[PDB]
Ligand binder design. Structure first.
Ligand SMILES: C[C@H](Nc1ccc2ncc3c(c2c1)CCOC3)C(=O)Nc1ccc(Cl)nc1
Ligand SMILES: C[C@H](Nc1ccc2ncc3c(c2c1)CCOC3)C(=O)Nc1ccc(Cl)nc1
Ligand SMILES: C[C@H](Nc1ccc2ncc3c(c2c1)CCOC3)C(=O)Nc1ccc(Cl)nc1
Ligand SMILES: C[C@H](Nc1ccc2ncc3c(c2c1)CCOC3)C(=O)Nc1ccc(Cl)nc1
Ligand SMILES: C[C@H](Nc1ccc2ncc3c(c2c1)CCOC3)C(=O)Nc1ccc(Cl)nc1
Ligand SMILES: O=c1[nH]cnc2c1ncn2[C@@H]1O[C@H](COP(=O)(O)O)[C@@H](O)[C@H]1O
Ligand SMILES: O=c1[nH]cnc2c1ncn2[C@@H]1O[C@H](COP(=O)(O)O)[C@@H](O)[C@H]1O
Ligand SMILES: O=c1[nH]cnc2c1ncn2[C@@H]1O[C@H](COP(=O)(O)O)[C@@H](O)[C@H]1O
Ligand SMILES: O=c1[nH]cnc2c1ncn2[C@@H]1O[C@H](COP(=O)(O)O)[C@@H](O)[C@H]1O
Ligand SMILES: O=c1[nH]cnc2c1ncn2[C@@H]1O[C@H](COP(=O)(O)O)[C@@H](O)[C@H]1O
Lengths: 341, 341, 343, 344, 343
């Protein structure tokens, strides 16, 4: 009676995309999309800014495949800036054809970098911009805050030559606040991550399909949104884009690949790599932890998993008659399914 | 807000048929139904066009039991045509009575054959028609496509003497497209198969009860529909027909029978046979796979399982007072149930 | 669009009874109720007409505890009649007191007996009435049928001196058909039984809370209904009565008791008794089977389990302020819960 | 100190056969063997005398494949005699060829039949012999008993025209007692059966490799022995024969085949057939405490495929051991004992 | 009494090596050993002749790491000869250093090739020798057979310029027969493989530690033996060598590496490669199958697994005071442990 229930909110498993009349085969769909209003990608995939997912080796591979990597901020300003320079200066071998590379106007691979909102941020942003970073990601657990909103405005006013992303958010109200602060895109996801315990610790969250819809509906395509967290299968990517996302950010799916940070580890015969939330105890070494720490099976070169995922999205776009990403964003139709489905 | 949710879609487990006033005992119900507007069956069962389910041996057994088999197209044109001749030329032993046999005007067992939409299709259809096939099934993963619609029209205009089925579809819109192209029946099922991973790979699907209803409601009985996939129990068959289906196609339920292709294999003391999606890696050896491959327990002669399944349908029709299949299609009443039941 | 969905139907696990203002303690609640319009019980419990639940030994114990047993029909006419006489003639020892016994006008323990609708039924009913049976249960899987409706009418017209129950049904329409045929009560339950496979084999069923409500709403208390099947806990009994039931029938809960038919068998060091659906292969040994056969753990004397169950019902009536059964039937209020409220 | 431990007794899983110098390929080995001193089989396989394993249908298939079936005795005398006659007079169509059929000197398929030691045994034996049975199996839980010994001698004395097997036994002492009674073979197995609970109920039993060895060592091939119970894999058959068995009897392995008695049951999507010990509760109904269990086995299809697989494994084993004929394996086999780690 | 039990035979899990007085550190031990009397390796590791383990890519990697690969024979003669030549003429690239490479007198990487005893064997041997193969492995399930013994003798008499290995065997008697036939080494292993079902199908086998000991004791170092099958951990390698082996052959350990044949398949979100016995139904497509067919996790570059395995062996040799492989072969002392110590 006094309980304010805004909606019944939906996650990936609550919905299915409907097939529609199609004259496009999966092999012919275009996966080109925009990361921000100023940066386009050749595939809608972004690697998570996590110290077990994205350092320079992953970022290079992501850009070589047409996506982009967000360097995590769990490292010194000098280290993060060197990581940026490694990507911007990377030169492919003489027998290395990457025709879908995501590059800036100077022919250099694109890369992003995460920053916080604390006292070190101005120096960190300056160093990253000096090194040639393409986009600054003001990246916190709660983007709908004075700290994030004002830091986004500060990056936009002081470094207009770089693109800036703000997050994480889960509501249209948060999206409009970041839009008015000057963000070139927003990152959506409070609660969906595979290693998230925010739902348990804080009781806070927004099922990701309804989060994407709420943000996309408010933005009216003024800036794109990145759907961050909860992607377990390629089918989740198609659902996210059909719900309004322009790109997808993944951590678990890229953890354990050769290019992800960390050494492979022998354990019970099998090979593993570490994967941990940035709000886990180890990552933070004050707030109680909001992420778990675990192992993911060794996956080999990231290009394999990326090919599998993009192949699944191509199949979905064939089913929906979507020749280009914007077709899926605009024309997707869903059904809600029950627990039995 | 911008998220288009067409409906909450229901699968078999979401609904139950209600008992109704009955003056018919299960033993006296008639299971006769129509496969296409021109072909009638004595039972509503169709064996899947899969290379672990239906070759000539299964097709003969299906027809002898009053149903029909759809020979899979994972074989050469000449091989598939020889299979058709095997069924059309089959003569039962002089101490074997199959009074419910499904036969053509010439007294030959009926059989169907699957074809695709690619360049080999014209020659394949011509070879199959010449061999005496009763029905051509233009079967793809996505029947709501120009390729399938135009190939169905091509078969109807060029081989009016054969019946043609188009699929697979999941919406009334798709059914009307195939109806207007000349289909004699449509096959319904996107996502429900037991070996299906399309839901996970592409995020695509339609819970099968709502798929049947959407298609049946648009067709208004102008042509019948085949409910293809997701049948695990005889109860599912009754639900599918009550929702509007005229026949049921099954793979898993007939996989592992003696008549299904493949050898029985010893594994942990027990006998199995292989069962795999036609979009599995093995079946395909480029689309990423959308089906799994596994083992199913050995089931002995298919007549046993067919008898069990039809006995359950007879029971259901006794409970609903349905003396003939069309009674169940017209008078079925359902309740929706929760996850607790 | 063409799909006819009558309702979202609820089972026991979908609902909870709400506590209400109470000035009655569980110990002071009255469990008296009516089995039929002419037969009252001292507790709302009926033992199932199953060959692993109710023969004369269970029927005697049920009546002694204030309920009634329905003797199963998986036996010869002379056998079932003898079972009836065993109950009607039973004499308790002068050192055993059962003050709540359910007895007829002659002071004899009450008992019921199931019959079918086939050719043997007229003779079977005649033998059972001759032996003193209190109620005939025309008992089939599908009571909404000409066979059951007309057999109920025949028993009422030819043997007006006995009470008659018809079932099983799951809809108000079926209840009214049996009412018009002269049923003194109806038995409700299509699908809910613990050993049922009808939902899987036939795709047929009605979640039991909605079945009870549909039947009770149509009858408007002209005759009572027996809620048959799916009772796993004492809480299900309160829910069933709150939804409109006057009595509940149980098989699984009384299977494995000392008084149930069958010898104990200890298997892997533990004692069990058989429990099987009457539509199971073994029971029928043609319709495909619609029930399973299994073992239930040994439970000892049935009086204990009956005491546990009625104690749970008494607690619920304390929570709901229900001093008598009819209070719970008339005043119960429910909430619907989600899957997380169950788990 | 006072505890009498005769030996450490070994089961199938305790031992492995060793490879040896070999010149004969598995495809060329001979599987012919003795059932009794007077009856040979073309393969060393006997189907168990159990009402879920062997009636006339199974017995016919066993003989067609070169083995033999023992008809169970859980039926009245007339019924069991009729089962014998069904096997003895079965004629195959000329469209089917069973070149390895096991037949008597008249060209009729061979068959055996079980009898007990109860009061109906004289009439049952007479009826089975009159029906043409090839071998009478005096079949009890405890062959080393006056009852079985006396009944074996009685059959030999009154019906010398039939072969007689006595069992079940587990020691050389028991074997010599049945030999002296006139038995033409002994059946070895107390404890090993898949559905046996004798070990739990009575604390009685003998691991089957040592049982075979104990019996074979005492008999010194004067008569053959049937290794009855505990066979799970073809490898068990080779080990049993290497330990001295001339044939093996199987129940579980042939239960659930098309030819076994009983209808296929549909249970949770899968097909099964019943399999139960003859000392189970249900078997003793239609006063000892039960000593067997009752359950389901997966449906296995035609028994011929199972038999072919088992004999294929034995052919492989004989190739490894350099055994051209069954007697080579019986006389020349070498074993190693393995630890629990070797079994894991 | 008549049962002939040769011994209680031991597998790897039955025994442990004892530490001994030691002066050389693991980093300083020598892992050099001999594959045959004429061929030395820099590490005691051989990749199995299986179509899911060793083709030319794996053989090159084995040789570069100091071991050797045995090319499987499940391919026609021209294909297997071409695989030999691919290894023999492989030339490392610039900035590529493999200081431990195992090479012939001409500086070419070593490689072996399996042959059977079937009708194509004479032509296959001739082609493999002509292609520069270093060792012919006459490889069957049963080396103690006229077929293998006579084929070994044929290779030695007609192609003396090549080394020849015979197997598989499990007894000293078999070892002497192959020695007499002219074998330059024998391969030991009947039953121990990870994918073996010979023990279940045929009841045949010899626990691998006792097999190694029986063979080594009979040979008295006249020729070396390859311990083939059952290796799961680096500790198994040390035990095998301490029991008398000069090299070990592995299949499962190298299956799933990047260099093994076959593509990585995606399954339940994890990556795998096929691994199957050469006696499995899949590989054979008449004997009943004696191996299983499955999938193993993807392991990445084989160099990492080899490095881990050799690291474990170096540790073991540090514990045993073994500065070179022959020290471990000659001086190892064992204890037998119970199933409680294996817990
Ligand atoms: C301890 C916790 N650490 C992290 C770190 C990285 C994250 N990255 C993404 C997301 C979350 C993250 C939480 C949580 C919400 O879902 C997305 C965190 O900072 N908690 C937190 C709680 C409330 C407020 Cl006001 N400020 C911060
Ligand atoms: C690889 C995959 N292979 C199969 C094969 C047989 C099938 N048979 C029935 C069904 C499906 C099947 C998928 C999937 C949908 O549910 C029913 C397939 O062709 N994918 C696909 C995706 C999108 C488009 Cl445009 N075209 C094709
Ligand atoms: C084989 C099956 N045997 C039983 C036996 C006792 C039962 N007792 C109670 C209930 C059911 C029972 C089913 C099933 C429905 O739920 C309550 C049965 O008779 N099937 C059946 C189906 C359709 C029609 Cl027309 N007639 C009968
Ligand atoms: C109850 C039990 N019934 C059976 C029936 C068939 C059997 N068939 C083979 C075997 C056994 C069997 C037991 C048990 C030993 O292992 C082989 C049986 O008769 N017990 C028994 C115990 C002691 C004595 Cl003096 N007499 C008999
Ligand atoms: C079917 C079976 N196929 C294989 C193939 C490769 C093997 N490779 C190594 C090993 C074994 C292998 C068995 C089995 C023993 O352990 C080592 C095989 O040929 N059986 C066999 C049995 C008896 C005889 Cl006389 N000849 C051969
Ligand atoms: O400790 C944490 N708690 C909650 N969310 C986190 C934490 N660390 C990272 N995340 C988020 O989870 C995403 C990874 O989600 P995943 O792809 O489902 O594994 C990241 O991109 C972050 O948005
Ligand atoms: O690889 C595949 N993916 C998805 N659906 C498939 C695939 N192969 C076959 N199907 C469908 O699944 C049906 C069999 O479903 P089932 O009866 O539930 O086993 C077939 O008749 C096809 O419509
Ligand atoms: O074979 C059967 N199938 C379905 N329902 C049955 C069968 N046999 C008995 N029943 C019903 O199940 C009730 C027992 O249900 P329970 O108390 O949940 O064990 C009986 O009173 C009958 O109404
Ligand atoms: O009730 C029983 N208890 C113990 N052994 C039995 C019983 N019934 C049969 N057997 C034995 O078990 C054998 C079958 O063993 P199996 O091949 O391991 O299943 C029969 O041939 C009998 O010797
Ligand atoms: O099918 C088979 N059955 C038994 N042994 C086999 C089979 N295929 C290969 N082997 C042996 O097993 C070894 C590999 O064993 P692993 O290293 O334990 O996986 C090979 O080198 C062969 O000696």
């Amino acid at each position: 009676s006094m309980l304010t229930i805004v909606q019944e909110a939906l996650t990936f498993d609550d919905v299915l995309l409907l097939p529609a009349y199609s004259t496009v085969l999966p092999k012919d769909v275009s996966l080109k999309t925009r990361l921000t209003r100023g940066i386009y990608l050749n595939i809608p995939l972004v690697s998570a800014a996590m110290d077990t997912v994205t350092e320079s080796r992953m970022a290079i591979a992501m850009a070589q495949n047409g996506g982009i990597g967000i360097l995590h901020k769990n490292m010194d300003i000098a280290a993060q800036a060197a990581e940026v320079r490694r990507v911007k200066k990377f030169e492919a071998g003489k027998a290395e054809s990457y025709p879908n590379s995501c590059k800036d106007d100077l022919g250099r691979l694109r890369v992003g970098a995460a920053v916080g909102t604390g006292a070190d941020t101005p120096s960190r942003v300056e160093a990253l911009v000096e090194a040639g970073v393409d986009v600054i990601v003001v990246d916190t657990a709660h983007g709908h805050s004075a700290g994030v909103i004002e830091r986004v405005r500060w990056v936009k006013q002081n470094f207009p030559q770089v693109q800036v992303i703000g997050g994480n958010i889960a509501t249209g109200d948060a999206a409009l606040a970041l839009l008015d602060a000057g963000a070139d895109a927003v990152k959506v996801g409070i609660g969906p991550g595979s290693i998230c315990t925010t739902r348990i610790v804080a009781g806070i969250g927004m099922p990701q399909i309804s989060a994407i819809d709420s943000v996309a509906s408010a933005l009216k395509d003024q800036i794109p949104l990145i759907a961050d967290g909860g992607i377990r299968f390629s089918g989740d990517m198609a659902k996210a884009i059909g719900a309004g996302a322009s790109t997808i950010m993944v951590g678990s799916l890229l953890a354990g690949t050769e290019e992800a940070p960390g050494e492979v580890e022998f354990f019970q015969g099998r090979y593993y790599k570490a994967y941990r939330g940035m709000g886990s105890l180890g990552a933070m070494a004050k707030l109680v932890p909001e992420g778990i720490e675990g192992r993911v099976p060794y996956k080999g070169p990231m290009g394999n998993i990326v090919h599998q995922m993009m192949g699944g999205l191509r199949s979905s776009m064939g089913y929906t008659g979507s020749a280009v990403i914007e077709d899926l964003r605009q024309n997707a139709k869903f059904v809600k399914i029950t627990s039995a489905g």
